[PDB]
């Protein structure tokens, strides 16, 4: 659940993503998470290798930030206005400390 | 799976096709696809042994983030200090 359902183009703070993982039966979870930010332009999906961040999830909560520099440099074009009209997606993978299984949740 | 006879009559043309779904034997299947792994276990020089992992990637470029899940034998524990050096 991102804090805002958008990304301001001039926001120097950058996109912020909050991971909230919980067990099905109402108990909190502990483990580690994987986040990768991809830019979706219609049917064309472009990935950002340098945005891969290994964040530890504590009490079913965690955060990760994409600095605007990474978004600008990931695409070859350094222009800003061209990015208007596109979309981003988050492909989060959560893994237990036990290593039982992992779930790929994508927004 | 058996042979059958086709009988057609009347005006018009139609497309008749037969597709058979079967489970075929694999050829040169690699259970360790894209990941060549080599575990070497040796006795140490309380009972303890030195455990070694040698890993490699089959791709052209260096692989992305990888995970080494380890589930040791019954009644075994990792050495604390070794994990301390491996952590930092």
UniProtKB/Swiss-Prot annotation, chain A:
The modification Phosphoserine is found at residues 61, 67. It comes from the Eukaryota. This is Complement C3 beta chain. It comes from Homo sapiens (Human).
Swiss-Prot record, chain B:
Transmembrane segments: none annotated. It comes from the Eukaryota. This is Complement C3c alpha' chain fragment 2. It comes from Homo sapiens (Human).
């Amino acid at each position: 659940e991102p804090t805002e359902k958008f990304y301001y183009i001039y926001n120097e703070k950058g996109l912020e993503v909050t991971i909230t993982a919980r067990f099905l039966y109402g108990k909190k979870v502990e483990g580690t998470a994987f986040v990768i930010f991809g830019i979706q332009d219609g049917e064309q999906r472009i990935s950002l290798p340098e945005s891969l961040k290994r964040i530890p999830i504590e009490d079913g909560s965690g955060e990760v930030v994409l600095s605007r520099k990474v978004l600008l440099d990931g695409v070859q074009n350094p222009r800003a206005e061209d990015l208007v009209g596109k979309s981003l997606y988050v492909s989060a993978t959560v893994i237990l400390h036990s290593g039982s299984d992992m779930v790929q949740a994508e927004r | 799976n058996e042979g059958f006879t086709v009988t057609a009559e009347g005006k018009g043309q139609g497309t008749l096709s037969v597709v058979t779904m079967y489970h075929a034997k694999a050829k040169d299947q690699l259970t360790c696809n894209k990941f060549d792994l080599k575990v070497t276990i040796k006795p140490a020089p309380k009972n303890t042994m030195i455990l070694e992992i040698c890993t490699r990637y089959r791709g052209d470029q260096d692989a992305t983030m990888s995970i080494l899940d380890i589930s040791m034998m019954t009644g075994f524990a990792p050495d604390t200090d070794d994990l301390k050096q491996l952590a930092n």
